[PDB]
Design an enzyme around this catalytic site. Structure first.
Site, mmCIF file in Angstrom:
data_model
loop_
_atom_site.group_PDB
_atom_site.id
_atom_site.type_symbol
_atom_site.label_atom_id
_atom_site.label_comp_id
_atom_site.label_asym_id
_atom_site.label_seq_id
_atom_site.Cartn_x
_atom_site.Cartn_y
_atom_site.Cartn_z
ATOM 1 N N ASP A 430 0.752 -1.387 -0.772
ATOM 2 C CA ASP A 430 0.050 0.150 0.153
ATOM 3 C C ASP A 430 1.371 1.104 -0.198
ATOM 4 O O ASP A 430 1.840 1.188 0.513
ATOM 5 C CB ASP A 430 -0.931 -0.191 1.483
ATOM 6 C CG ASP A 430 -1.177 1.067 1.842
ATOM 7 O OD1 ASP A 430 -2.091 1.439 0.981
ATOM 8 O OD2 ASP A 430 -0.565 1.747 2.721
ATOM 9 N N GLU A 483 -0.161 -0.902 -5.005
ATOM 10 C CA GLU A 483 -0.800 0.952 -4.852
ATOM 11 C C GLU A 483 0.084 1.519 -4.854
ATOM 12 O O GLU A 483 0.916 1.886 -4.339
ATOM 13 C CB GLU A 483 -1.391 0.925 -4.089
ATOM 14 C CG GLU A 483 -2.658 1.423 -4.147
ATOM 15 C CD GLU A 483 -1.959 3.471 -2.631
ATOM 16 O OE1 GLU A 483 -1.900 2.964 -1.759
ATOM 17 O OE2 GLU A 483 -1.607 3.956 -3.807
HETATM 18 MG MG LIG Z 1 -3.469 5.337 0.548
#
Ligand SMILES: [Mg+2]
Ligand SMILES: [Mg+2]
Ligand SMILES: [Mg+2]
Ligand SMILES: [Mg+2]
Length: 755
Positions: A430, A483
């Site tokens: 992330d 991401e």
């Molecule tokens: Mg975020």
């Protein structure tokens, strides 16, 4: 080797098989060394020595007995290798069982760790059950180069460390062997720093930990707790390219999927433990164990038809409310849900059911908690000393010093650990931007540029590339998912091509475009047709994963149904049209728990999902819809073989904004597997709507999101439609379709139908 020595091994007469099995130096040349690796592999017909970091593989030969193998290799150092072992028609890849003859750190171990290149450091740092001087016990070791003293405190000495003071080796690592204690031992390290301040630390390399908010580490005999059954899974993984397969991920937060009753013990794999209460404000509820999750989550997922489960971070973390994203125990699965062997069982049961396991992994920062990594030895050891690069002030956390060899080693070996010891199939990272940029969330004059004047965090880029290079060399066939929310280029491209080495990237622009689109009242979607089509413009620059994640159904964003305009019927219809579109759009798929049954309320990490909703038809129908969509996805090659090639996709028409209709083809290797997809993003039905198709013949209505069994109005083409020789959208043939309201159709040519 002689036949006498071989037979000593075969017949269990040898006094110490480590003398001959494993890796042994034969001779030293000018610029290289000659090594032999030997193995005894009963029932294997063939074996190889893989040197994954050099991209080499050498056959082993049988020597004196068909199951005794030798391999002679010339190379300067032979630190990193695996054995590939073939037993009949099956191959497995393992570390050498004879790799390490003692539990203590060798000089070689220390040198490799000092350089940052010890890929198996966790076999020697932490706590390990073994034998020294003829006596069984535990060996402890910890990196704390500036500490004045370190002692082991624990249950075994009533937390008094005076007779368990450690020895410092090479000015860097402290060690201690403690006889007659074993797995289950509770301990910490007691450190005194250069100022003489005394404090207590959990084991950075600890394998198990008390239940939060308690922080003691616990000794685990990690290689002797669980028997795996997943060799065939692992073999198929290694031999397959996941980018060419269906990848449909069910994203799960283990602590909030389903709770049990705190009035009973937590069952474990052959055992039980006291219940872990979810919170002081919900005291009747407890977490489910890894074992109960294997018994409940896995068959749930299998029946829904997902290919993979992605877990929010399961590494040990002290606060439920971080969701797992503030980790303090990097080498241990959280004890909220039981023991290491219970998570091993979970992963083995996934593999038995043909489901992969992807872990969210959190290398970007760590919180300041006193038990954890911060200011570990009385200096900035794990974090960088300069807060401009060492702290994420807006989050209150600390940033690893990615350039520091032993810190880089802690994190690179930790990624590998999860694949090694827990057999996982992928990781996701992330907020990769948090690592990549030296000015991340920092005001002017509160960060400094790199050595070339730029904002790139050089040390972090180097670390990310090293992780991805190593992971794919040791474990081909995995998923490494990022991401990254700044348009950093080449995220999901190989390192050799200037990439960061991930193989998939979440398409955050796609997610924003879609959810913004569907939130628009349908009459107004004509002004935002570009939201539908724009993400195909940049699509081929990365390998995209289409993810609708946990982050999108919290903090006042609503759950999926609540995002949609209209009456209850239309809200449902919008959900089915979005997800049908998602599953037909190029890219792999991820969706979060609760989305599949239409939970109305936002995800609440402090309770469990609203399962009572599945007593009611509209929720049941939406769950059936996803069950059938996942089944179709795995059944239709054109939805997954060519996601990342131009061949796999072509718009048919995307100009009809006024009616918010779009249409496209998906293709695979066989032209007869081509699919025609037609989307109607308003509630206006169309009785006759012409779509161009590439061939004559009967097009079966293979899927229709307005089917009555999904909660729809049951409008559609009554099985399918014969194409007309009526040129349209630049194609020779065309279908005159009925388009249901707020719905997607998938059609497929049946070249054997009777005219
Ligand atoms: Mg975020
Ligand atoms: Mg004391
Ligand atoms: Mg716009
Ligand atoms: Mg509940």
């Amino acid at each position: 080797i002689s036949a006498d020595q071989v037979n000593q091994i075969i017949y269990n007469l040898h006094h110490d098989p480590f003398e001959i099995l494993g890796c042994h130096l034969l001779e030293e040349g000018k610029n290289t060394k000659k090594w032999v690796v030997r193995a005894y592999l009963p029932k294997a017909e063939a074996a190889w020595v893989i040197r994954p970091t050099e991209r080499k593989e050498d056959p082993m030969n049988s020597v004196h007995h068909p199951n005794f193998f030798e391999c002679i290799i010339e190379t300067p150092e032979l630190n990193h290798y695996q054995l590939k072992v073939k037993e009949g028609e099956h191959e497995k890849v393992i570390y050498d069982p004879y790799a390490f003859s003692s539990p203590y750190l060798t000089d070689e171990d220390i040198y490799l760790f000092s350089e940052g290149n010890h890929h198996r450091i966790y076999e020697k740092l932490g706590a390990h059950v073994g034998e020294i001087n003829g006596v069984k016990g535990v060996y402890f070791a910890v990196w704390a180069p500036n500490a004045r003293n370190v002692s082991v405190i624990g249950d075994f000495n009533n937390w008094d460390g005076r007779e368990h003071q450690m020895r410092k080796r090479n000015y860097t690592i402290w060690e201690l062997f403690v006889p007659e204690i074993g797995s289950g031992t509770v301990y910490k390290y007691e450190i005194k720093n250069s100022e003489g301040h005394i404090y207590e630390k959990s084991d950075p390399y600890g394998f198990y930990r008390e239940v939060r908010p308690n922080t003691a580490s616990i000794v685990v005999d990690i290689d002797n707790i669980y028997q795996w059954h997943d060799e065939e899974w692992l073999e198929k993984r290694r031999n397959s390219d996941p980018l060419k397969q269906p990848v449909s991920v069910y994203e799960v937060h283990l602590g909030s999927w389903l709770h049990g009753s705190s009035a009973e013990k937590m069952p474990l794999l052959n055992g039980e433990a006291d219940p872990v209460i979810v919170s002081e404000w919900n005291p009747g509820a407890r977490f489910l164990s890894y074992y109960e999750l294997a018994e409940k989550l896995i068959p749930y997922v299998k029946d829904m038809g997902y290919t993979h489960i992605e877990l929010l971070p399961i590494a040990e973390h002290p606060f439920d409310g971080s969701w797992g994203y503030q980790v303090t125990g990097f080498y241990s699965p959280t004890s909220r849900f039981g023991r290491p062997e219970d998570f091993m069982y979970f992963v083995d049961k996934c593999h038995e059911n043909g489901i992969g396991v992807i872990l969210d992994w959190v290398p970007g920062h760590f919180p300041k908690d006193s038990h954890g990594l911060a200011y570990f030895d009385g200096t900035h050891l794990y974090e960088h000393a300069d807060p401009r690069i060492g702290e994420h002030k807006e989050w209150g956390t600390l940033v690893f010093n990615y350039g520091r060899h032993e810190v880089r080693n802690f994190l690179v070996a930790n990624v590998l650990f999860w694949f090694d010891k827990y057999h996982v199939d992928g990781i996701r990272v992330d907020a990769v931007a948090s690592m990549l940029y030296r000015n991340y969330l920092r005001k002017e004059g509160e960060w400094i540029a790199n050595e070339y004047g730029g904002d790139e965090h050089i040390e972090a880029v180097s670390f990310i590339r090293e992780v991805n290079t190593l992971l794919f060399e040791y474990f081909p066939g995995i998923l490494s998912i990022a991401e990254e929310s700044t348009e950093w280029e080449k995220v999901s491209r190989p390192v050799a091509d200037g990439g960061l080495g991930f193989n998939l990237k979440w398409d955050m622009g796609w997610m924003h475009d879609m959810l913004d689109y569907f939130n628009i009242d349908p009459y107004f979607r004509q002004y935002h047709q570009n939201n539908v089509t724009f993400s195909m413009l940049y699509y081929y620059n990365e390998n995209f994963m289409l993810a609708l994640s946990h982050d999108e159904i919290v903090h006042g964003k609503s759950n999926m149904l609540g995002k949609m305009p209209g009456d209850e019927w239309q809200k449902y219809a919008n959900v089915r049209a979005l997800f049908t579109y998602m599953y037909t759009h190029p890219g792999k798929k991820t969706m979060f728990m609760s989305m599949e049954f239409g939970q109305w309320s936002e995800w609440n990490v402090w309770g469990d999902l609203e399962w009572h909703l599945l007593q009611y038809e509209p929720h049941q129908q939406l769950k059936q819809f996803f069950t059938d969509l996942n089944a179709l996805y795995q059944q239709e090659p054109a939805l997954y073989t060519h996601d990342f090639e131009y061949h796999g996709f072509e718009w048919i028409d995307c100009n009809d904004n006024t009616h918010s209709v779009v249409s496209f083809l998906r293709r695979s290797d066989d032209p007869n597997d081509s699919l025609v997809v037609v989307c109607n993003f308003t509630p206006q039905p169309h009785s006759h709507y012409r779509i161009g198709v590439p061939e004559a013949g009967y097009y079966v209505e293979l899927f229709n999101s307005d089917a009555k069994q999904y909660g729809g109005s049951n409008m559609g083409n009554l099985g399918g439609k014969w194409a007309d020789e009526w040129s349209f959208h630049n194609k020779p043939y065309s279908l005159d379709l009925c388009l249901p309201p707020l719905a997607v159709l998938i059609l497929k040519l049946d070249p054997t139908k009777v005219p």
